[PDB]
Amino acid sequence: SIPSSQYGFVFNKQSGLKLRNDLPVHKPKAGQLLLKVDAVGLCHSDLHVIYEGLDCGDNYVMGHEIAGTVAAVGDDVINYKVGDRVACVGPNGCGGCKYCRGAIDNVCKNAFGDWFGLGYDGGYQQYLLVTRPRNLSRIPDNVSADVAAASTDAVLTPYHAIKMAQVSPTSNILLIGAGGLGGNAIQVAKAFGAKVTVLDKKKEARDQAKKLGADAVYETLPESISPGSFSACFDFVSVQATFDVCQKYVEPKGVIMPVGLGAPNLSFNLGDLALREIRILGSFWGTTNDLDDVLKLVSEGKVKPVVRSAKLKELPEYIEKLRNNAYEGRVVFNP
Amino acid sequence: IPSSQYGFVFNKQSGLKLRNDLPVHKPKAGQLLLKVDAVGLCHSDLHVIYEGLDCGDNYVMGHEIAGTVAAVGDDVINYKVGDRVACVGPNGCGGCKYCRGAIDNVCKNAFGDWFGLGYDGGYQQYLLVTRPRNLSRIPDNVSADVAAASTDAVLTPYHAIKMAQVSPTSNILLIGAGGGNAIQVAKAFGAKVTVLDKKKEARDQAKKLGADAVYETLPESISPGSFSACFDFVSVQATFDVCQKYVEPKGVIMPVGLGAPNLSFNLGDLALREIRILGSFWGTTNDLDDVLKLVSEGKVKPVVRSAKLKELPEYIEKLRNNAYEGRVVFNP
Amino acid sequence: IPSSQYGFVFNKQSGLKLRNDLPVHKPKAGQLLLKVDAVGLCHSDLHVIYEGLDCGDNYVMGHEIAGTVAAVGDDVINYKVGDRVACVGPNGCGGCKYCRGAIDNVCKNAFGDWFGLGYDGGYQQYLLVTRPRNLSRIPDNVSADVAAASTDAVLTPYHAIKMAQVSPTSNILLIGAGGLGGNAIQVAKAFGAKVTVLDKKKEARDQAKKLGADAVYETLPESISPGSFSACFDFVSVQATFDVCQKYVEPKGVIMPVGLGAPNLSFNLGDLALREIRILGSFWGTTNDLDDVLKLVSEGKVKPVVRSAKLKELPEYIEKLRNNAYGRVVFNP
Amino acid sequence: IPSSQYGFVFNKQSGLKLRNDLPVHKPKAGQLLLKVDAVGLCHSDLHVIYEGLDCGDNYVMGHEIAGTVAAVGDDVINYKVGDRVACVGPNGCGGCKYCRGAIDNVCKNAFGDWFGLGYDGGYQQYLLVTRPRNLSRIPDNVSADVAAASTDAVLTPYHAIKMAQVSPTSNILLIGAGGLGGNAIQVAKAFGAKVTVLDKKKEARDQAKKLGADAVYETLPESISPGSFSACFDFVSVQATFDVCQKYVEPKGVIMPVGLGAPNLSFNLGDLALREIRILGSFWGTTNDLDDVLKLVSEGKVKPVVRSAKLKELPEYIEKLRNNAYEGRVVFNP
Numbered sequence A: 001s002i003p004s005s006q007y008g009f010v011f012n013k014q015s016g017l018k019l020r021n022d023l024p025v026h027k028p029k030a031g032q033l034l035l036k037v038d039a040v041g042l043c044h045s046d047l048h049v050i051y052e053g054l055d056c057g058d059n060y061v062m063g064h065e066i067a068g069t070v071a072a073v074g075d076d077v078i079n080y081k082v083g084d085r086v087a088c089v090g091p092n093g094c095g096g097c098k099y100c101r102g103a104i105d106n107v108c109k110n111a112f113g114d115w116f117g118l119g120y121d122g123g124y125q126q127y128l129l130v131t132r133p134r135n136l137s138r139i140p141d142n143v144s145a146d147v148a149a150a151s152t153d154a155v156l157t158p159y160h161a162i163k164m165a166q167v168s169p170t171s172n173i174l175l176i177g178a179g180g181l182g183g184n185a186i187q188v189a190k191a192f193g194a195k196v197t198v199l200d201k202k203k204e205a206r207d208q209a210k211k212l213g214a215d216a217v218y219e220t221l222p223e224s225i226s227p228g229s230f231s232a233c234f235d236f237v238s239v240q241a242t243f244d245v246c247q248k249y250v251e252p253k254g255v256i257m258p259v260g261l262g263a264p265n266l267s268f269n270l271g272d273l274a275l276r277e278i279r280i281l282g283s284f285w286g287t288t289n290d291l292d293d294v295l296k297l298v299s300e301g302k303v304k305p306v307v308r309s310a311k312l313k314e315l316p317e318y319i320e321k322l323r324n325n326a327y328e329g330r331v332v333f334n335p
Numbered sequence B: 001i002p003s004s005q006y007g008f009v010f011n012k013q014s015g016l017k018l019r020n021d022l023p024v025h026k027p028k029a030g031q032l033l034l035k036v037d038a039v040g041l042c043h044s045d046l047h048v049i050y051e052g053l054d055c056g057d058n059y060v061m062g063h064e065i066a067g068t069v070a071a072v073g074d075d076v077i078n079y080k081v082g083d084r085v086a087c088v089g090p091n092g093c094g095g096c097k098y099c100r101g102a103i104d105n106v107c108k109n110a111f112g113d114w115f116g117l118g119y120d121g122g123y124q125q126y127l128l129v130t131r132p133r134n135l136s137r138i139p140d141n142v143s144a145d146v147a148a149a150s151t152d153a154v155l156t157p158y159h160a161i162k163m164a165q166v167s168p169t170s171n172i173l174l175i176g177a178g179g180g181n182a183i184q185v186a187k188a189f190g191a192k193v194t195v196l197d198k199k200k201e202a203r204d205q206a207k208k209l210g211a212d213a214v215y216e217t218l219p220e221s222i223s224p225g226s227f228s229a230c231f232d233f234v235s236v237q238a239t240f241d242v243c244q245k246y247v248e249p250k251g252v253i254m255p256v257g258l259g260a261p262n263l264s265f266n267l268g269d270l271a272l273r274e275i276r277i278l279g280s281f282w283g284t285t286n287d288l289d290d291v292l293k294l295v296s297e298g299k300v301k302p303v304v305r306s307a308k309l310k311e312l313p314e315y316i317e318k319l320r321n322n323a324y325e326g327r328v329v330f331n332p
Numbered sequence C: 001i002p003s004s005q006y007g008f009v010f011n012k013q014s015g016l017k018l019r020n021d022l023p024v025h026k027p028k029a030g031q032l033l034l035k036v037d038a039v040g041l042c043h044s045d046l047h048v049i050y051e052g053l054d055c056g057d058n059y060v061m062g063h064e065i066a067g068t069v070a071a072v073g074d075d076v077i078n079y080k081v082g083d084r085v086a087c088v089g090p091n092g093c094g095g096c097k098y099c100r101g102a103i104d105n106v107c108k109n110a111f112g113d114w115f116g117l118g119y120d121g122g123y124q125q126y127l128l129v130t131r132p133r134n135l136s137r138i139p140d141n142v143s144a145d146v147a148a149a150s151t152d153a154v155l156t157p158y159h160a161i162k163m164a165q166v167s168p169t170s171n172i173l174l175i176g177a178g179g180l181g182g183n184a185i186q187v188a189k190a191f192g193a194k195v196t197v198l199d200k201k202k203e204a205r206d207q208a209k210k211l212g213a214d215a216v217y218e219t220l221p222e223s224i225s226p227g228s229f230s231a232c233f234d235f236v237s238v239q240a241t242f243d244v245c246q247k248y249v250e251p252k253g254v255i256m257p258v259g260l261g262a263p264n265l266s267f268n269l270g271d272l273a274l275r276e277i278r279i280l281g282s283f284w285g286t287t288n289d290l291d292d293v294l295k296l297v298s299e300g301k302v303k304p305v306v307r308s309a310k311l312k313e314l315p316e317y318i319e320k321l322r323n324n325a326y327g328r329v330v331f332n333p
Numbered sequence D: 001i002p003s004s005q006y007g008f009v010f011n012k013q014s015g016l017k018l019r020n021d022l023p024v025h026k027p028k029a030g031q032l033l034l035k036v037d038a039v040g041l042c043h044s045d046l047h048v049i050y051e052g053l054d055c056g057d058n059y060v061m062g063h064e065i066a067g068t069v070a071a072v073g074d075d076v077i078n079y080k081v082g083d084r085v086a087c088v089g090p091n092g093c094g095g096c097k098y099c100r101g102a103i104d105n106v107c108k109n110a111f112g113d114w115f116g117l118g119y120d121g122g123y124q125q126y127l128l129v130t131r132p133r134n135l136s137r138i139p140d141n142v143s144a145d146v147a148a149a150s151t152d153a154v155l156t157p158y159h160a161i162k163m164a165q166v167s168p169t170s171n172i173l174l175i176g177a178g179g180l181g182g183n184a185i186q187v188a189k190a191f192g193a194k195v196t197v198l199d200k201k202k203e204a205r206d207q208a209k210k211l212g213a214d215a216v217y218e219t220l221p222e223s224i225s226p227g228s229f230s231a232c233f234d235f236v237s238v239q240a241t242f243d244v245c246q247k248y249v250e251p252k253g254v255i256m257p258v259g260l261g262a263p264n265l266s267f268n269l270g271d272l273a274l275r276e277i278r279i280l281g282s283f284w285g286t287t288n289d290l291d292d293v294l295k296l297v298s299e300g301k302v303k304p305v306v307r308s309a310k311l312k313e314l315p316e317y318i319e320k321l322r323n324n325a326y327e328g329r330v331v332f333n334p
């Protein structure tokens, strides 16, 4: 059954992203595993590499939102067996440095340039070689491959940030801008049982937020909202104007989470941040264990990743759409 | 216990002026009167006097206070006359979630009502303490001069170090620490300390204070993103960029200086390497107890100079001109 | 503004007796007089009356208080006549390192001075509050009865669940759910954690499941993998139930012996060390906790179920509780 | 290099035996071959050899390894031939939530596969390290002997002390400064805590004073107020000593039962709950802990006393240790 050749989309600084019908199907070494891709997602991050000069390496199959079934396992591999359904952990940490093993494999220096679909081969192919089974998460039986894949980033990232902020049933948080992880952030936040107030200019966003379970929805925060009264602020747009709002409404000892691509630099009022001991925390993707938590929240139905499916050979057709106007959520491709 | 007293009152107009007819209030129920023995001075005062740092108006300055309880009011059994105590600058209310949440230093109700910074301070003879909870017993082997200095010079950096969770395995960077008990405190936690300061004088001082490595410029070998924590005591865009540059992934940046009113950080870098910027303000009441205990045990030895309170005007000018180094306390 | 009142006072000699000549203390500076609107009852009271539990002597009982500020002595700035508040059991001094360290529930100076357990409580018409810092404003949408019922039934388990750092990804085990933390399940459910209940009484199991429990058992089936729970709350705290916790708690997990069981409990040293298990003691709750608790109730996260009756009927209910489970009954002075 | 080597293999039926025909494994990929420079010995080995402690069967013993990378398999880039590294006992799998959660010392999959305790150890010339993640680089100023002597004697107490969150403002009580309790004083000192030691042995007390202990007692004096210690580390862990901890630990304080005194221990429930005392279990140490340990040793904040000897002398040292004879930490060079 297992072929010796396969098709996939390999990225190259020259020809860009093109289809390859003569790609090899690597046989796993002792300690490695071969994953048969079932669902692979697409998002703006891929656009950065293909058009915004974001260099994550060269000559590698793209697709960082993987979900599939183990096709073959090398000897010594006892934690996984053929048939096991798992989702890939993007950062793909080395698992040996102090960062990995330190519970933060998402900021691994050695894995830099070796992330799934972003430096190292990804899911835009039929069979992916997993050099380090450590960066995988078992997919619950009630969770489909399309959903799982749609959680590897659209849910994992916001989840990581939410947990980093130590949100609880007593948390009073503010979210700036829905859509683009903002939506899934609403669900995740509410999963911790926290009160959620949302701010967004776009019309749809608010209606969507209100639908997702947002306790508060505004196009502009009223005056009845006392400044410095929110325990946590997540800025999904991350622009000076929006960052200023966070610092204004974040309560003393509170936290500001700039999780947007707004501007390259952002300034903060030192006097205020110092006197009220405000804290700015950086957040990137998610950790391996975080993915296990996310898949559990999805399995429990606490987070509903909304996505549509299509065959992988339609990727080019969808990459163009995302470049112009995009849609509302994500689309996973079936190899 | 006279009926009147002298002291220095600050006004956004008249500025800091000597007042020879200030009233001496008697402690009410739950209150206490403090006989100021030593009151310190630092740059924080200059920012309020000349650099427009509104903390209130028409209040006696001096936020570094050390004194002796001259009188107590009924319903006060915690303290008794003769007791030597130091004031907890923040002067929290004690009745909010912050104060009862172990962080009375960020008390909202007390904002702008700090000792010598909104509320009456130590630049006088007698200070009425409306909230004695914001006091710390001064160890017998700790003089008033040292205690007064420790209320800020030691308390602030201590609170920042503990907040950063520094340990004996921490590899930290201090910028402009020589210009100062921060180094001793850090070493008290057993952390490896590297000091970056341009002035040779400050460097020698740091080396003397136990610094493990002092530099005017970080040499090669000290790769970027290698420090677990970076404390900026100058807090200027140039110095902050150094911290973000040399702080390791998931490391912390503590902008503990009175530099620029605003600072910018690279969003991409901070997010990618999960760098965290933590604001730190003065210290809590519990921190002041810890600090005095550390000073008493000699873990931290503040260098203090003394003089009469009526000489304050002179040292103010000398300080703003950078005429002297080290801390100087005053005795009323 | 009566100068006299009635109430139930406890005494190691004559137990809990009704008094109709009790005085109505007038608040001094910093003090405050509270008019009791509702006061709860729980087994904790039985231990002090029928089981030599010494929390002091000669004092009005009732430690689940909820009332309205009737009078405030001078200097009182935070509260004033009309304010609806609930009492914080521990009644910390607010001056020690523990109190101003965010743990006023373990105040040493307050030992034996807890509301209704050392110091006068709520089983009266007017309670004198020596330290008004130990009060929590009652939200507008929360009745006096519900609030009173939250001063212990919800507060205690909340504090423990919060201490265990339970999250929506937690897999906890609760031993005892028949009044023994009936609200614990709801509290845990509020944090989004999965809750498995173990109780020998069918009544408790039906109740547990109705309360939100994801799984209920009279005896954990062998099919349940040992050391698979992140946290275990023992509300009965007997050697047998503790051994269940240590066996099913996962490595680096926590055991919360929050029951009034045996005076002593033993753990297997080799196991605790090897799998790095941790046993955390938990007591009542802090002032900040009560604020969070009352906020959770106000938001609907926790819905305490309580029955009310006149304070005069206290003795009648104390017997009921000594013979069954239906406890969780507020009284109105 | 050699096509064969010698080493001491343990078998439930034959016991610990010298083997001159041991094979030298070739690292597949992601693995490496470690030439053992120094391997320590402690009482833990005796429990396996004579006290029936079952950690597995048919494996080279020696769980305190220090060596040099002799060869690396393909795909191995973090390490290269010549690197000096120490082994992390637990040898976690590195794939479960425990290992990925910063606590590889309690890995379930790895239980029964610890270096020298289930899996092959250091009592040989060349050790095949299956999971390189469980290694800690040895600072250039730290000898192999000292490093090996830190893999347990220092790592274990360090992990426990770190877990209790000791700080420059801590006031701790240490019961039993006989074995690992010795380096425990140096480690606690490194964190800046005040240390009060309680030990019945005279020599132990004298050692405590030398190691910088602030207070050393044969019996705690009446001047010591009950519930005044922020943390209590009990190295003997007997009911009598545990009661001491529960009596002298302050509210919210922590009791660390790091001994083998008894199979069970009881605590006063009322006391524990009312004052919120916490009992924390501690086992060996993590991989990152070893990094910290080697740094503390490298800086000279912890100085483990060690004497070396040829590996083929192990049998004699075992018997002597088995009788308390030499007593002093001893490492062997293959």
Ligand SMILES: OC[C@H](O)c1ccccc1
Pocket: A045, A048, A118, A153, A157, A284, A285, A286
């Ligand atoms: O959470 C990670 C995100 O998908 C991302 C990955 C690579 C580059 C930019 C952004």
Ligand SMILES: OC[C@H](O)c1ccccc1
Pocket: B044, B063, B117, B152, B156, B280, B281, B282, B283
């Ligand atoms: O953190 C203590 C310092 O004295 C200070 C207090 C108020 C304003 C600026 C600086």
Ligand SMILES: OC[C@H](O)c1ccccc1
Pocket: C044, C063, C117, C152, C156, C260, C283, C284, C285
């Ligand atoms: O923690 C609350 C409970 O009412 C209780 C208080 C004191 C003693 C035993 C039990």
Ligand SMILES: OC[C@H](O)c1ccccc1
Pocket: D044, D047, D117, D152, D156, D283, D284, D285
């Ligand atoms: O710190 C661990 C200790 O060496 C030990 C290991 C295995 C068995 C008993 C004790």
Ligand SMILES: [Zn+2]
Pocket: A041, A042, A043, A044, A045, A064, A065, A153, A154
């Ligand atoms: Zn993506």
Ligand SMILES: [Zn+2]
Pocket: A093, A094, A095, A096, A097, A098, A099, A100, A105, A108, A109, A110, A111
């Ligand atoms: Zn790594």
Ligand SMILES: [Zn+2]
Pocket: B040, B041, B042, B043, B044, B063, B064, B152, B153
């Ligand atoms: Zn100052």
Ligand SMILES: [Zn+2]
Pocket: B092, B093, B094, B095, B096, B097, B098, B099, B100, B104, B107, B108, B109, B110
């Ligand atoms: Zn306050």
Ligand SMILES: [Zn+2]
Pocket: C040, C041, C042, C043, C044, C063, C064, C152, C153
């Ligand atoms: Zn009760």
Ligand SMILES: [Zn+2]
Pocket: C092, C093, C094, C095, C096, C097, C098, C099, C100, C104, C107, C108, C109, C110
């Ligand atoms: Zn107290």
Ligand SMILES: [Zn+2]
Pocket: D041, D042, D043, D044, D045, D063, D064, D152, D153
């Ligand atoms: Zn050993």
Ligand SMILES: [Zn+2]
Pocket: D092, D093, D094, D095, D096, D097, D098, D099, D100, D104, D107, D108, D109, D110
């Ligand atoms: Zn593992």
